[PDB]
Amino acid sequence: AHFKEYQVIGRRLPTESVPEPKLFRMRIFASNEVIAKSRYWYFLQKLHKVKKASGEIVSINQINEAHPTKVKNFGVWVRYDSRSGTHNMYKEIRDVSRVAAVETLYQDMAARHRARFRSIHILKVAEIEKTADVKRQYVKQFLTKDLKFPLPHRVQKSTKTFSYKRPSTFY
Amino acid sequence: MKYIQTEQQIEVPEGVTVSIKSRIVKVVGPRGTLTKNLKHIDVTFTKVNNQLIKVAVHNGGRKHVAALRTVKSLVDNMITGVTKGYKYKMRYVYAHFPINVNIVEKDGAKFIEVRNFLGDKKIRNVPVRDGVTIEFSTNVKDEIVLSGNSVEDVSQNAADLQQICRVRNKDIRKFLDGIYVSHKGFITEDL
Amino acid sequence: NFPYKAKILEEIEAKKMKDLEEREL
Amino acid sequence: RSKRSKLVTLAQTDKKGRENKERIFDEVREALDTYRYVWVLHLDDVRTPVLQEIRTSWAGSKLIMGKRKVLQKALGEKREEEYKENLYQLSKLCSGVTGLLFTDEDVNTVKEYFKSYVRSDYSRPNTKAPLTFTIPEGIVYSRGGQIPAEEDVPMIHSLEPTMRNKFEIPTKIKAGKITIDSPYLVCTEGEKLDVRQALILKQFGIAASEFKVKVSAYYDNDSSTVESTNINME
RNA sequence: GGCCAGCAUCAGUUUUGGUGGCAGGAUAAAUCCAUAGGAAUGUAGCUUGCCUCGGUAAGUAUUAUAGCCUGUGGGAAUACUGCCAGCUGGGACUGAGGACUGCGACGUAAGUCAAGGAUGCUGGCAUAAUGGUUAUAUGCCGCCCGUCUUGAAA
RNA sequence: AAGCUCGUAUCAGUUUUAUGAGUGUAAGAAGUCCUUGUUUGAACGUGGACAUUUGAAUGAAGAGCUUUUAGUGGGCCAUUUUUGGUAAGCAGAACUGGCGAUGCGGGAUGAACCGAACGUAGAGUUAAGGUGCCGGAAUACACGCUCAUCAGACACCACAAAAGGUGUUAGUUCAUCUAGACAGCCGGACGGUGGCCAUGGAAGUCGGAAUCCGCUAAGGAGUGUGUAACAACUCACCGGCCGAAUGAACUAGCCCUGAAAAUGGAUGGCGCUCAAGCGUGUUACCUAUACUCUACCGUCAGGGUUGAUGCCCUGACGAGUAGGCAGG
RNA sequence: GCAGUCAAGCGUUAUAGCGACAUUGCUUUUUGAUUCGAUGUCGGCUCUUCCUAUCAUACCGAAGCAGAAUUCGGUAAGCGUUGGAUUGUUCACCCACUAAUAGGGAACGGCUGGGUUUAGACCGUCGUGAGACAGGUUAGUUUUACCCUACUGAU
Ligand SMILES: [Mg+2]
Ligand SMILES: [Mg+2]
Ligand SMILES: [Mg+2]
Ligand SMILES: [Mg+2]
Ligand SMILES: [Mg+2]
Ligand SMILES: [Mg+2]
Ligand SMILES: [Mg+2]
Ligand SMILES: [Mg+2]
Ligand SMILES: [Mg+2]
């Protein structure tokens, strides 16, 4: 859906003579908290040897974008499952929010790589602070000074079946 | 990749006027006028001054930018044709039967008549396209000169003349008779 | 192609240096 | 897809890298300390036997060629990066095919040798024609009438497509011999020559031009100043 | 009083709008304001090169005759999610039951009520008008039965 | 189907707890306590006594014992375990589902596919599948990919060698680069040397073996064209001009090839190309004998009652071949 | 086909195990010399159409293609693709003509000879016999159309 970013902090259940287990925190992109907790337990079992029935969720908090009205360049480091193994991938997305950048990446994976949400892992989303560090041409072409471009061949949407005038595509 | 904007430049010399409206190009120079219809390609022509013209594609792909470069080359060839012209020299050779080449008029249509190619009784006729001139060379043996402002027309006429005299059912290693384009260049030879 | 590879490497080296002694003492 | 494919050749010589430029850099900066006079020489379109003859005649000195940018970087491009004092003028005096001559011989002897040294060379494009060449009518010979035709071996038939297409000379093959219907003037004395005319002259073997090494200037170690020579700089 | 309707006030089920009051999160993040630094897709200014009478090409200059980014501090609003035994408009189907009993509400009070299932007011027709039957038309659906074989259009 | 009893009675295609195995057993009147009799211990007992905090959860109103008789029996398909395998199909065991006896919505059409099981109706909402037109329902919105000289809208098996392609898009890992990137043009491309043997001839380039040294910026005892032999050109390599990115090897998506017969025909048809195709996201909408509310029919059940196998009140149910019972 | 070799890959940190393209040996050895068990369905005549996996005719490409002739290949189904001999067998083979005598499907998931040919008969093999067959030979009645549709013509 429309993605939201959460922090999930969990731990093992405290035991006798071994109190205060260490806390672990993950940043999870998900549509709701149920999916976020499911992803957290999945990744915790995949990385550490912690099971959901042996652990507990200490906290889950939504993380809002700090400056949602500022256009930013994002580098997204992801990995996906395959029969050969786990493959890295780096993409660059120009957007005003981390969650919208993640949604764009997921749509791009569904379109090109034929990938799925459960098979795509979001490893890192980092804002590119300097314009010189952007290294994809399809993003660099929008960083040029005094950028202008027209929108030729405009198609207007008619609410009526029949039109009494030949249409124009001017803009 | 969908580049935002791709452009090419066309340089206009002093004696040439180029008019573009809805991709109908007219080029006027000392040697005459040429017209081109470029409505099968979506490009935008812009004038910055009387010596430079830009042609651009907005949000295009590989085929689109290839067509852009092709458009620039075609307009350059039109400018070259109106300012210098094009001139193709062909030589015809034979082993035993002298090839006879003439200019004839069939209801005022200017055909080129080829006789005695490999001793054939058939008379081959190649029409002369509009805008090209045919002249039998001076102090050069068995040479034809095709001149004009349209390189496409001159080269197509030369190709038709070459292909009308193909050798059939013989070993071409042995039989060398034919009409071959020997040189391509410009009419003006100031330098 | 990631830009902050140096920062990632520095962070993982620091984590290794800390975890070397976090189990020993 | 849809890209140009690079031709693959199985040869014995591999490409050079940055190490060769580093070696030339180090050798130039060592020769700067080793020798006393550093001359800048222009040797455009020089034949390798002629260059080797110059090297042999200058026994005990050093002549270093290579990339002009590498040599200028070795000499020091500007004043804050120059290897020695006032070497940036000598570095910026380099142009084209530049040779650095490191020596201890007398300045007058070097000037005398480079003013008295000259060799016959092929005529180059965009240079003045040293003579007028016209291939005579009839069978085309290998020298093209410079020597008597009876002495000269006739031109080999394999070069006829080259003469007809590349040289744009109207030629025919009669009984395995290259023939022309009329005399063909190719170059006129005192006229700028293009690539095709230079190729025709080189093919017929006419060598009437001269090669003279150009000397731009030199730098002295003790005085630490550059003096302009202006030798063969017409 | 038999037939067909219209409106009003209700009850049961349901559909579709408008509007109000609250609660939580980083006691939303933001925008905005104040303050301190920073850079370029370098704003004013300065320099030189030489350009259509100064518009530019490249060096400098971090707010100047534009602005932007980050940190910190301050006061709000809004979005999102949820709650109301908040209010209110439009539409559809249904009216089983047949003296009273019960549980309640508004009422000092006698009484009244939307509270253990629809009543009130009005019009036309009074007969082929509604309705039934019959012949057909239209839209969609529908293979020929019985028996015997897994199983049968096969 | 008949009797007898009992009915916090009897239990359960389930879980939990304890204990086994790499699904089995057990969880109280078929108990427990004291008292010390039977052959200082096991195993059998004398007499008295503790209950509705009588020994986990959830559900259940019918359970148990005697008698008593109609129809039937070697079927197909699928999933999960396991043993042997074949060109390939598969064959033998264990268990569980679907179908026969079964209509309804959808998959165009259908023995095993998806949804859903059926009294007569009304209203509402849905499932699966869909919403260009046939055809009820957005030629909706949004991000990308694709052009097929018979694309695709498919079962996820085979053709299929993860093979071929100078189609296109996105990635990964290595390299070159203002002491100059990919292309292009021009110049150099040397000397011993026509290296040795062989040949009529063979000089880098018909052959057989060495394949070195010098000078270099660099130059093979030569990558090819060429000659009878040489000559000449070329490239391997270097340099000059140009001035900013580029090359190689792999991976993935879509596209093309990846073999086809024989009356004329099929994504169901029309047709569709920033789709009406493919991947994905957000909403709205369409409609089943399904779900919810109401009425009515019947059946069963529980209560009331001084035409009583009638009447009144309440609740839940309704598929069906052989066969059974009942009322007409 | 079997047995082996190599290694572009795949696999691994245990040079285990798979493995494309290639390649070796046997079948099969050097001087162009000199028929061996189809166990159950076959062929004709007349006449139509279709496929292309093209024999000829049309147009092309390549090859030591001089010319002539021929070989290999591409597009191509518009148009043709024959007359006879042979049954002590023909699941074919010869002679000739010809531009050429290409392959196949709509059956093999109407007349007519082989064939499912029942009653007569003889020979052979087996059986004690009734009889059966490893078999061989000969003789032996199935007979619509005026119905619907399709097709050809006609109101
Ligand atoms: Mg109501
Ligand atoms: Mg009526
Ligand atoms: Mg029907
Ligand atoms: Mg509709
Ligand atoms: Mg096949
Ligand atoms: Mg559709
Ligand atoms: Mg879609
Ligand atoms: Mg074909
Ligand atoms: Mg008989």
Residue B94 backbone dihedrals phi, psi, to 5 degrees: -150, 160
- Whether D179 and D172 have beta carbons less than 8 Å apart is answered as yes
Is the CB of A118 within 7 Å of strand E?
no
Cβ of B183 and D168 within 8 Å?
yes
Question: Does domain B86-191 match CATH 3.90.930.12?
Answer: yes
Q: Å between D158 CA and F86 C1'?
A: 69
Which three-class secondary structure state does DSSP give residue A37?
helix
In chain B, the residue whose alpha carbon lies closest to the alpha carbon of A152 is B58
Q: Which strand G bases fall within 7 angstroms of a protein CB?
A: 11, 60, 65-68
Q: Which residues contact B120 (CB under 8 A, 6 or more apart)?
A: none
Closest by Cα among D187, D28, D169 to D99: D28
The contacts found for B97-105 with CB under 8 angstroms, 24 or more apart, are: B97/B177, B99/B142, B99/B165, B99/B177, B99/B179, B101/B136, B101/B144, B101/B179, B103/B128, B103/B134
Chains B and A touch (3+ CB pairs under 8 A): yes
Q: From CA B27, how far away is CA B46, in angstroms rounded?
A: 15
Chain D residues 204-233 with Cβ under 7 Å of strand F are none
Distances (CA, A) of D160 to A135, B132, D176, D178: 55, 31, 10, 6
Method: cryo-EM
Domains delineated in chain A: 2-68 (3.10.20.10), 69-145 (3.10.20.10)
Is the CB of D46 within 7 Å of strand F?
yes
Q: Which residues contact D187 (CB under 8 A, 6 or more apart)?
A: D129, D131, D132, D133, D193, D197, D200, D201
* A145: nt with nearest C1' to CA: E41
Q: Which residues contact D72 (CB under 8 A, 6 or more apart)?
A: D91, D92, D94
Q: From CA B172, how far away is CA B56, in angstroms rounded?
A: 48
**Nearest CA of chain A to the CA of C3: how many Å?**
6
Q: From CA D199, how far away is CA D122, in angstroms rounded?
A: 10
Please give the DSSP secondary-structure letter assigned to residue A112.
Answer: I
Q: From CA B22, how far away is CA B14, in angstroms rounded?
A: 24
DSSP string, chain B: --EEEEEEEEE--TT-EEEESSSEEEEEETTEEEEEE-TTS--EEEESSSSEEEEEEEEE-HHHHHHHHHHHHHHHHHHHHHHT-EEEEEEEE-SSS--EEEEE-SSS--EEEEE-GGG-S--EEEEPPTTEEEEEPSSSTTEEEEEES-HHHHHHHHHHHHHTT---SS-TTT---EEEEEEEE-S----
Task: Tally DSSP H helices, then E strands, for chain C.
Answer: 1, 0
Q: From CA B79, how far away is CA B122, in angstroms rounded?
A: 40
Q: Hey, where are the domains in chain B? A: 1-85, 86-191
Which three-class secondary structure state does DSSP give residue A159?
coil
Q: From CA B87, how far away is CA B145, in angstroms rounded?
A: 7
Closest by Cα among B32, B19, B16 to B131: B32
Q: From CA D201, how far away is CA D109, in angstroms rounded?
A: 36
Q: Which residues contact A114 (CB under 8 A, 6 or more apart)?
A: none
Token readout for A48 is 């550490």
Question: Does domain B1-85 match CATH 3.40.50.720?
Answer: no
> What is the Cβ-side half-sphere exposure of residue D12, based on CA atoms within 13 angstroms?
0
Q: Are strands B3-11 and A87-95 parallel, antiparallel or unpaired?
A: unpaired
Is the CB of A64 within 7 Å of strand E?
yes
Residue B4 backbone dihedrals phi, psi, to 5 degrees: -65, -45
Distances (CA, A) of B189 to A42, B85, B177: 81, 10, 31
Q: Do domains B1-85 and B86-191 have the same CATH topology?
A: yes
Q: At which residue do the structure tokens 């005096």 appear? A: D93
Torsion angle, alpha carbons of D160, D162, D167, D173, to 10 = 10
Is the CB of A70 within 7 Å of strand E?
yes
Closest by Cα among D186, D187, D178 to D138: D178
Please give the DSSP secondary-structure letter assigned to residue A92.
Answer: E
> What is the Cβ-side half-sphere exposure of residue D63, based on CA atoms within 13 angstroms?
16
